[PDB]
Amino acid sequence: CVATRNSCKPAAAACCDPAASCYCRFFRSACYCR
């Protein structure tokens, strides 16, 4: 869905890529594409 550590989703950190998977940090309340 997104490149990496940029913008998993157009609003926060929520990737869509099936093979990939962001990382929930909580600091911002979301999961960034590590």
Protein model, in words:
With 34 residues, the chain is low in regular secondary structure. The chain has one domain (1-34). Helices cover 0% and strands 12% of the residues. The protein contains no helices and two strands. It has strands spanning 23-24, 31-32. Strands 1-2 form a two-stranded antiparallel sheet. Strand 1 (23-24) and strand 2 form a beta hairpin. The radius of gyration is 8 Å and the shape is globular. Keywords: Chromosomal rearrangement, Disulfide bond, Glycoprotein, Knottin, Obesity, Secreted, Signal. Its main location: secreted. One of its GO terms (biological process) is cell-cell signaling.
What are the SSEs and their pairings?
Elements: E1 23-24, E2 31-32
Range of helix content? under 10%
Number of helical segments?
Answer: 0
Q: Mind telling me the C-alpha Rg? A: 8 Å
Shape: globular
**How are the strands of the largest sheet arranged?**
1-2
> Can you summarize the main beta sheet?
2 strands, antiparallel
Tally of domains: 1
Order of helices and strands: EE
Structural class: little secondary structure
Oligomeric assembly: monomer
Domain Agouti: 1-34
Organism: Homo sapiens
Disulfide bonds: 1-16, 8-22, 15-33, 24-31
Protein name: Agouti-signaling protein
